Amino acid sequence: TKEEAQETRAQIIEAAERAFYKRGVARTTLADIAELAGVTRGAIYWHFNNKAELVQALLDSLHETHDHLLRASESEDEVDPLGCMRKLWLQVFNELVLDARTRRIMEILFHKCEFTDDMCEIRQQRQSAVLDCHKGITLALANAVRRGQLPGELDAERAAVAMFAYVDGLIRRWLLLPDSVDLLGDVEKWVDTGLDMLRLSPALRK
């Protein structure tokens, strides 16, 4: 049955989040996740080959809320690629602080997920996700340069690395020390600080 299968996969993913958040990925097994989800008869193995597929599902689930702002910032036909990128990072930070699911998937991926040789797909799939995002940020920065919103001589690739590094570090800083960063109250200041680096730093120019 169609709906029941998606029914069950969502139960498993939701239970996987609870299990990974409590006990970490390394020591959690699929059998333990099936126990939390209330699924039996090997159902979990029909939806996932291994834990890495479950981790990838959680990582893929983050790309959904922002799909439209990603598309807009990457499109050559977009009139305001820089403004759309600003709206994107504003949404990324807002969802992190406001959404329990997002914050806790990211906490799982960043602080409860080990890169090991017996589970090499986790690091490899993290490399691919970061690389994919870098391509998107680089392309959106190149659209802003062409629109006259960023320096004509900007090194879009290095500026994409710089922006990602800043956003990445800020998120992890808020996850580790929520009290230290009023990410929600000053979200615009935090987004503009990184954008300002791309706009003004002479080091980021070719």
Ligand X SMILES: O=C1CC[C@@]2(O)[C@@H]3Cc4ccc(O)c5c4[C@]2(CCN3CC2CC2)[C@@H]1O5
**Among 112, 136, 139, 147, which residue sits at the site for its own copies (rule: CB under 8 A)?**
112
Which tokens hold the place of 14? 């939701």
Residues in 113-142 at the binding interface with ligand X, rule: CB under 6 A: 115-117, 120, 122-123, 126, 129-130, 133
- DSSP assignment of 97-147 equals HH-HHHHHHHHHHHHS----GGGTHHHHHHHHHHHHHHHHHHHHHHHHHHT
Query: Does 83 participate in binding its own copies (rule CB under 8 A)?
Result: no
Binding mask 131-150 for its own copies (x = CB under 8 A): x--x----------------
Nearest to 125 by CA among 175, 83, 64, 62: 62
- Bridge partners for 169 per DSSP: none
Query: Does 192 participate in binding its own copies (rule CB under 8 A)?
Result: yes
Nearest to 26 by CA among 104, 117, 106, 112: 112
Query: Does 65 participate in binding Mg ion (rule CB under 5 A)?
Result: yes
Residues that bind ligand X (CB under 6 A): 59, 62-63, 66, 70, 88, 92, 107, 110-111, 115-117, 120, 122-123, 126, 129-130, 133, 164, 167-168, 171
